[PDB]
Write a protein that binds this DNA or RNA. Sequence first.
RNA 1: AAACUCCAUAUAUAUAAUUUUAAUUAUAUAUAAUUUUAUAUUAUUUAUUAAUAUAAAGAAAGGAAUUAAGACAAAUCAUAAU
Lengths: 246, 192, 22, 344, 138, 396, 49
Amino acid sequence: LPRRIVPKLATFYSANPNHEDRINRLERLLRKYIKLPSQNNNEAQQTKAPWISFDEYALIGGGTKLKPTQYTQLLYMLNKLHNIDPQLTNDEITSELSQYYKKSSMLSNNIKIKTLDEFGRSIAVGKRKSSTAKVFVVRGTGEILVNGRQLNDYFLKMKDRESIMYPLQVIESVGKYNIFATTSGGGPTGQAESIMHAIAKALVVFNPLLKSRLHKAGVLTRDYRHVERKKPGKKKARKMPTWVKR
Amino acid sequence: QHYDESLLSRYYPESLLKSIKLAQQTIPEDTKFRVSRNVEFAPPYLDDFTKIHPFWDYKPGMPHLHAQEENNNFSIFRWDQVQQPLPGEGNILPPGVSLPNDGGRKSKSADVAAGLHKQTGVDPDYITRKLTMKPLVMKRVSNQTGKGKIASFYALVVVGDKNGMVGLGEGKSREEMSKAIFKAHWDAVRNL
Amino acid sequence: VSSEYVLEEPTPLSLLEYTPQV
Amino acid sequence: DEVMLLQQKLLYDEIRSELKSLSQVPEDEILPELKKSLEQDKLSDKEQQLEAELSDFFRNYALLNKLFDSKTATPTKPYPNLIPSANDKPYSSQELFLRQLNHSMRTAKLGATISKVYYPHKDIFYPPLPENITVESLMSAGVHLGQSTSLWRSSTQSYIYGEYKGIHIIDLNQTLSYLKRAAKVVEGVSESGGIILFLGTRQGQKRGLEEAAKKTHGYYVSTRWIPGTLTNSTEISGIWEKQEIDSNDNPTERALSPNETSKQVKPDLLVVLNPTENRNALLEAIKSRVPTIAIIDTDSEPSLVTYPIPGNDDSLRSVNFLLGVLARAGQRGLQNRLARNNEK
Amino acid sequence: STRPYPVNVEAVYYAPLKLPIKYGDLVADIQLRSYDNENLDFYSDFILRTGYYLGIPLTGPKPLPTRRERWTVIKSPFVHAKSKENFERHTHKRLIRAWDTNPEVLQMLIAYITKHSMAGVGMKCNFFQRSEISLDLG
Amino acid sequence: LKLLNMILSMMNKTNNNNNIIINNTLDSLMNKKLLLKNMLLDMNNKKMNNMKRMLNNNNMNPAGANPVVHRIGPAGNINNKLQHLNNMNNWNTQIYNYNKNMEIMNTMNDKLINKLLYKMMTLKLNNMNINKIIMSKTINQHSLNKLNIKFYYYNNDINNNNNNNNNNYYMNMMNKLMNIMNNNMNNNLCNILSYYYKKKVTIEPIKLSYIYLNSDIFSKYISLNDMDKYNNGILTNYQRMLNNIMPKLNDHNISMNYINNINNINNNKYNNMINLLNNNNNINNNNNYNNNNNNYIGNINNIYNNMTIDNIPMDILMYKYLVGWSIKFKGRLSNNNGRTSTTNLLNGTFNNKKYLWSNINNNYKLNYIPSNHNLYNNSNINKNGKYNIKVKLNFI
Amino acid sequence: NELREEFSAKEYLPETSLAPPGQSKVDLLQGSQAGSKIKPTAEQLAQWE
RNA sequence: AAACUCCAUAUAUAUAAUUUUAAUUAUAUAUAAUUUUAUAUUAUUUAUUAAUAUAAAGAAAGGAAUUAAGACAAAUCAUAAU
Ligand SMILES: [Mg+2]
Ligand SMILES: [Mg+2]
Ligand SMILES: [Mg+2]
Ligand SMILES: [Mg+2]
Ligand SMILES: [Mg+2]
Ligand SMILES: [Mg+2]
């Protein structure tokens, strides 16, 4: 029985034999089943298969030689084969696509849902520059106590009080909640913005549906801005001594 | 606890049974164990710690921090050999690599023959026994570039079997005449 | 791969010379 | 039975509605009332056996159910997923499609039968045998048309029958002779068991190349010829993998040495459908001693190729015709070899 | 099925065990300092593991703030002052508080952990002694 | 208290489900053919939640899991002793004392004893046999009780392998040194060092066979024992040997198989835990796990299945192969032209692609040296001046 | 009795043996139906509207 | 060169018997982003395409370390060594 060596793949001599062979297999399936009209219902009943990523395709069949055009054509044909009427499809199509619409599908079992405390208070923490603010918000009238002191006593600046309010007025609940704010660190502005952020976070516990409104208002986005550190050979951050031509 | 006198003597040396007994009578049953995620203390694998494994536990009789022998108890007196060699096969060859051997190192014709057989399937035996090698010109070639004069080794060589087959090949290298003539010999064998 | 493990309990005499200085 | 199949396909959902219900209400207002009735319901009736059986049921079902199991046929019926509609209600779209298929396969064909009409797929799938090709067939395929006079390569002066409508006309007689010889050589390599590589890069040739390669157990290239494929095989193609096959062309599932798989594997015959745009492959084949075949137009060098086939190369019909003839020659050769080693 | 693995060896593969405090008095306070939190925490786990067997209620490795020394030095041997380079040194601090234990047991704990102290760690021990107002010292 | 009446309550709820005033709802078997199955469905969903908590809160695996994988668990850990160099090894002196002055004193002593160790290596036998024992830097380990000095040494020429066992009847000029280090009773150098450190001292001469397994030994050997081969010009044979000390390894394949092996490790541990989660737990009734704070699955042998010291430890170790090295000869290594000369010999690669596709992350020693790099400079004096041998080695 | 007989009759996967009527032969699901979450109250809807 | 890394960001988990309280904290481990989509308009290697428009979801926006080869016989024999 004479024995001889030949290449594995029919496209062995092409640019990317593995991708070409896989594309040819998918093409055989599609050509065999050009009948079987597609699923009319779309969007809500289409694109559900996640398929595999660029790197996943590269490792399985692509390699460094994988090309984005090649990959996009692959998923184009995969989507064409998946968008077939479900009860006219065949085990051949399902088996072929099985290795392609693989997804890890990590089970989710962490929620960490938040709820009010035993006195009906929502506790939130906010930060800004080098300051932190912990707010106890409980529904009521429009009363506020900052660090055990009156708002006008603690914050002499009007803009700080307006900033504290802003979440309340975007949700027009200024007269519906009592705020007990305790802050430390930074200065007036830092503490005021931290309180504002904490109130914005806390309000969502009462009516979760308005998180979108608060986020659009921007109160739910913490400000990462902080002072840059001084650099060597530089008077400050982004300032160097005077330069001399000679 | 888990096992009291359950043939434990057959599985552990008598010297440790006292420690196991004390552990059973001090750690209570139904203890609410929890794995640690901050720090790691136990090995990723599973071991009973009852045998001193070479290359994975400190060699007895040899100095090392965390030792318990005195300065008068060390039992190592020869240093002409590597203490604690590797375990298992005793070698760490990667997949698809071979221990270096002669490999025709005495004649670069063997390397040329192997390479040309690999690339184009010609006969290594024929190349190694029935071919004659002869340099013709071996000179230094220079290129002037931004950095400076980059000298290059240029060789031209005739390879022939003295029975009709003849070819010539040119080889250019950047490091040594030997690599230059190696390339030239390769090219000549291709161009017989 | 097998070597016996010899044991010696940590008696207070052994732990001596390492008690706190104060 | 069929009633259980036709029970609206979604029934007893009030149980799900209820289990959803009674959860929104707090426990303090329900559980005390229910728990203050056990003292009454205890009474004195014998329960030991029944409660033991119930506890065993809970242990076995609720507490011993295996969520993930294990350590780690013939599709006789088609459209198994397909489901039927109600008798009174109209057809479903899928039912209409299947009835359409039934009609197409049984009644649609009725009427007359077609003859003396061209069908492109038949060129690829039912090519003629080389001994039956006619000058009429080649002319119909269009092999005779060549490039315009203004692009004429004078080295092809022997293959020109004349010039008409501003383009040269190749001599189909010479085309037929050269085609017969090319078919014979491809068939010869097929019996010899060599490697036949069909190379065509122009658009639309992939179908023909793939069909020819599969039916002669060869190989094909249609995307691009990587320079150095044959002259630099070790680098271009060493990473890929080879097979060992018996005389019958069946994989034998034998492990291969790294060096054995890293050796070069060279074609025994190279057929190029687009020599003009594929000069590099011809040069590699010549310098690596691989016999080659090509379709030569009136603007291509015939000397680059061992076995030229004077003909058009810019039309799918002509290239498909010629490639299919070559492929069927190779197929007959493979059939002869398979027959001989199957029965001595 | 296989050879049994007793509780002593099964304990190594889980977090160290603690003994509850029944009175609440602080007998000792051991602060571990090092430039390498890895050895620091490994040795702290060892301490908390020996304390259980020796019957000493130990609170656990409280991470105290780390201290960052900073220096700045020019990169050149001679005049190039516009380029300077910074160097830092972090001191990591852990605390283990020992409650409700006899002085001799505490002594032997400290002695054993000194016997088997790692490299690059340092121990500062504060011992507390209850006493009466007037002591007979003759 | 007991479901004997909650069953009746739920039956009334089913009656309401049909209508608030009707006797009962659509009942195939008096609401027992599939209502019980739905009850079991919700119970098993509760089991699903508790079960994934059970597994998640009891996970600890080495790092190296490729994110592309699907069976990989949520947990990861790079600090495994076998996969990263403890930062205490970064510094030649490993000490912390609350007394800064004592700390300074001890580092001074460490440096001076290291230089003494260097000077104490060279040996003579017969006035025409000069033996140099190249030694790396000293790793001084200052525990609270004892000091340890550890170093790697390479003899210039071990006794010939072809030579018979004659070495068993005399002690080499190097064996004598290593024995007087710490084996002599009242004379060993450790006794003397104990006076300077007021501590118990130990010394460990770890042997190395090849010079290129360490950056210190390699540069030292080139700069001290191979002058004649590059003084007036680098010899071609010397260059060839120096460039072919090590073969051309496939770093990509090595890294890929390492990552795949870590993937297999994690996945088979996950499978062990899952089979204990499902196959076991039969006799032991549920709710005994007390998932709120207790997480004990079962026997450690079953949690760690087919994971012995014989397969796991070796295949996870890092920095095992040398996949790149560069040597720089700089200075006046030429009688001709009387100028500075630099010659660079670079082979292999200098990047660990293990960190490029996996979750293992590189750590910079001293915040400027990549973990996979070890480099050293050694300066010596020839008749023309000083010259430097700089060696950089990359281990994967 | 008949439920036990039915369970013993099958010799395949537990999900296959279960096979609820409304399709979904597999009862593996992630999360405690967190996708639906908690039904909002009428006051919350009024405010949000 | 990018990534990997450190200071910062968010979340979780673990330690502190909250009298080293700063729990609004400290630092060990892990996750996250070099952000995702959806329709718009110009277009255009045709859809597989970018630049925008911005319904939506997200806490997510910075900083520094690293400055190759060659050179200017640039500075350094006053950091030390030659
Ligand atoms: Mg400033
Ligand atoms: Mg043409
Ligand atoms: Mg960079
Ligand atoms: Mg530069
Ligand atoms: Mg000057
Ligand atoms: Mg000087």
